[PDB]
Amino acid sequence: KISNIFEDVEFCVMSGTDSQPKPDLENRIAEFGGYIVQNPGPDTYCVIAGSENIRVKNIILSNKHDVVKPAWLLECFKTKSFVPWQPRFMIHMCPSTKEHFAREYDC
């Protein structure tokens, strides 16, 4: 919406509390068009997770997407633009996310 880069990029804020509460993260992601989805949607690029809870451990046990610490979403928001995957926030991540880590950073 405000920054359409998060539009068409579904950020599954299903349980995010590391930086901001999950309702607040969902509100801000919809403020930029990231879809408020409670289980990774078809467009979910990465699950914006939070404190290591039942949902975060669901994502860890069932790697549908990453366990993204909402600090990665903070760096995305402050830039007002989707910041690529970084091996410094997402504790648990999809193999494509580790591949991105190796793509634009070292191991």
Binding site: S15, Y35, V37, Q38, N39, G41, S51, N53, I54, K57
Partner: protein, 473 residues
């Protein structure tokens, strides 16, 4: 039966919670009770309304009363409300926004309780109020005692324990061990609706109702509703016999039920299809009496239930069943009944083994006075393997395994074991409310316990091996 016990959490704030301080342990008690209730009964309603407060937060706004989660079906709302305050830091923040011990009139809080119990619109069999205090907190009490007595007349029960059975002196007249309340009770469904009583065709002129209520039988996980994967809202699941060669959904005039038997699909109609299920009528058609000696008891293996009368449809249920169970002592037989729960049902040959009332000192209705369903098998389902009885008992072996195992003598508490799936997922629901891990595991005690201590009790089967190869692998 509509009607349960409505419970409210009327907890005093007279700094009788603040001396561990009684507040934290009381909050653990109430949270554990709510954890039990959310997994047991939403029909029972829970009211987180505390008094003694520094605020007048209540409907009529009386002295030193606070409302947190009024009478409602249990849920994570009260769980989190008490969780934010359970800790000692939780206790101090609680005392910050709620308040500390203050003065008030107990008539006020009892009036608020009366309003709460008279505002709910559920036919409620019982009413209960819990209360916590370190010691006896106390005109101020005479009106309080009068109002408490009146509430007791209204079916309201009062619960209080002094957390100093030592010091509740000023409250002994006022009043009408919480380790059990610390989630000892948990996850027990409370439903009282079930099938209409069946008609026992005991003879050819009088039939008697039998009370078969599947109300306290097996309980399992909550209903998995096909919520939306995005917003967690269910779907309607439009499903039926639909068409592809002709398209759309087939109409009942176009649907025929057949049976593929012999060499052809024997096409019948739906009317014949569902009217074939009957051999006679609904009820317990009694053929006669079958001696209990003629029970396979290696085929009495399916899910079995109880057979109780029902002194509601016929006057003679209680009468004739009392006489029958009085004379069951001299009988080694069972009421040989055919069982149809409703119309168009294939009756099953049922032996009614007399399971009479085990009225203890308190006359607890364990094995209520009636009969237990004995399985009379048939010839289509048992995992039979060929018999081999060339092997009998040998004195050395029987003595050795006897000394190995005879020490472990149990009593078979029928409800001792815990269902893995049921309690597992119910406490997992508790954890979901807590937003935490898998809390704890339920199991039908399927890990053996004697094998780790049979040698501790002096096992000889391990000591005496019949072969260098494991004698029974």
């Amino acid at each position: 039966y509509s009607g349960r016990d409505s419970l409210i959490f009327l907890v005093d704030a007279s700094k009788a919670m603040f001396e561990l301080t009684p507040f934290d342990m009381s909050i653990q008690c109430i949270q554990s009770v709510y954890i039990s209730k959310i997994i047991s009964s939403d029909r029972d309603l829970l009211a987180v309304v505390f008094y003694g407060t520094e605020k007048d937060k209540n409907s009529v706004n009386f002295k030193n009363i606070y409302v947190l989660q009024e009478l409602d079906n249990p849920g994570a709302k009260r769980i989190l409300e008490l969780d934010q305050f359970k800790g000692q830091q939780g206790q101090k923040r609680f005392q910050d926004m709620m308040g500390h011990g203050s003065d008030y009139s107990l008539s006020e809080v009892l009036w608020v309780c009366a309003n709460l119990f008279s505002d709910v619109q559920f036919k409620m069999s019982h009413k209960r109020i819990m209360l916590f205090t370190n010691e006896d907190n106390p005109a101020k009490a005479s009106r309080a005692r009068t109002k408490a007595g009146d509430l007791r007349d209204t079916g309201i029960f009062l619960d209080l324990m002094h957390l100093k059975f030592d010091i509740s002196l000023f409250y002994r007249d006022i009043i009408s061990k919480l380790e059990d309340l610390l989630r000892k009770v948990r996850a027990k469904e409370t439903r009282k609706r079930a099938l209409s009583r069946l008609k026992l065709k005991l003879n050819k002129d009088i039939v008697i109702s039998v009370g078969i209520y599947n109300l306290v039988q097996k309980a399992l996980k909550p209903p998995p509703i096909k919520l939306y994967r995005e917003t967690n809202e269910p779907v309607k699941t439009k499903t039926r016999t639909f068409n592809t060669s002709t398209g759309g959904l087939l109409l009942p005039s176009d649907t025929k039920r057949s049976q593929i038997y012999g060499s052809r699909q024997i096409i019948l109609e739906k009317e014949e299809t569902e009217e074939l299920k009957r051999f006679d009528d609904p009820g317990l058609m009694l053929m006669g009496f079958k001696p209990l000696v003629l029970l396979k008891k290696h085929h009495y293996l399916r899910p079995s239930l109880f057979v109780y009368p029902e002194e509601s449809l016929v006057i003679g249920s209680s009468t004739l069943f009392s006489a029958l169970l009085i004379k069951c002592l001299e009988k080694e037989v069972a009421a040989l009944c055919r069982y149809t729960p409703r119309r168009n049902i294939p009756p099953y040959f049922v032996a009614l083994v007399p399971q009479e009332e085990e009225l203890d000192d308190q006359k607890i209705q364990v094995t209520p006075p009636g009969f237990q369903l004995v399985f009379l098998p048939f010839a289509d389902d048992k995992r039979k393997m060929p018999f081999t009885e060339k092997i009998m008992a040998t004195p050395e072996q029987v003595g050795k395994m006897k000394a190995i195992v005879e020490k472990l003598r149990f009593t078979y508490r029928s409800d001792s074991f815990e269902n893995p799936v049921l309690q597992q997922h119910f406490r997992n629901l508790e954890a979901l409310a807590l937003d935490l891990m898998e809390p704890e595991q339920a199991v039908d005690l399927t890990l053996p316990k004697v094998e780790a201590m049979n040698k501790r009790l002096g096992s000889l089967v391990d000591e005496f091996k019949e072969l260098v190869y494991p004698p029974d692998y």
